[PDB]
Amino acid sequence: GSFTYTFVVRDENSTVYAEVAKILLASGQWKRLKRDNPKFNLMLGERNRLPFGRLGHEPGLVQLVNYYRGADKLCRKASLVKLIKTSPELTETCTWFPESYVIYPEREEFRSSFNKKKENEEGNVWIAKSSSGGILISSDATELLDFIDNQGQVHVIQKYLESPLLLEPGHRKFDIRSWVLVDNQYNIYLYREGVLRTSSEGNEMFFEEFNQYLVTSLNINLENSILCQIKEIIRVCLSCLEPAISTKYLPYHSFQLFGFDFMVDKNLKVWLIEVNGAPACAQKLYAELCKGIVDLAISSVFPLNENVFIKL
Ligand SMILES: Nc1ncnc2c1ncn2[C@@H]1O[C@H](COP(=O)(O)OP(=O)(O)O)[C@@H](O)[C@H]1O
Ligand SMILES: [Mg+2]
């Protein structure tokens, strides 16, 4: 026992891996090195284009990284579509994902699906969204398709939620931000603490005070409706990704923290918005969280001398 693991940091802008590098030395079993020192057990790397090529080569050196190469395939708005449209065991069972299309600055099935709604009298309000980049919430197809060419960024038109479930007082809108960790073995872990971001119609609601509104103002509960469904979309998007990201054969390990973003309507339904690959958190959590990313994700590979997570 009593080993001394190494590690480097190639992303300092990251507040989440800034807090871990702190808890890391917080056990004196670790030691940071130079940004370009190959001799590492762990690498807290950059948000974009991480050099997964120089990993696994050092002999007798096992390396864990905080990103799963290719999980951008779930974090790219665009790619998020291609992925669900492709996936057979999903495209059918997919009722929680706004019909979206990627217009090449497709666009065909767009209008074709736009008319069918204009000709059946019903909501026909969409929203234009950028890949990694501006947005627009229109109803005139052409007033959009002719607006994604002025951007030249390849966007995605998505069904806008006309009937959102609001909050009282203030009668404001909101979205929930989950937090999922996936270690080297591939065990999903949902951090019990989520967070609501709201506006005027903003604050920051927490699962405790939020579950309040869902009963003493409403007729239901936080897990008897929402959590049940969230714990599914998540489980499904990841299980559909497992094949293209499994490091089961590469010469190194990797884990990652994802940030799911959902929306609920008056019908009480839950929809998925986006998934974040390098999501940050809330200042009242950076502590209880970052400790998990080391308890569950890190020390699971590199041992040490010696209720917050759900495994889907
Ligand atoms: N499909 C949608 N329907 C209704 N509202 C949406 C939809 N997608 C996103 N939103 C709203 O947009 C907000 C998020 O904007 P955001 O994604 O943070 O812009 P950006 O991606 O540039 O940071 C959320 O609060 C949510 O209410
Ligand atoms: Mg990887």
Ligand SMILES: [Mg+2]
């Ligand atoms: Mg990560």
Ligand SMILES: [Mg+2]
């Ligand atoms: Mg192991």
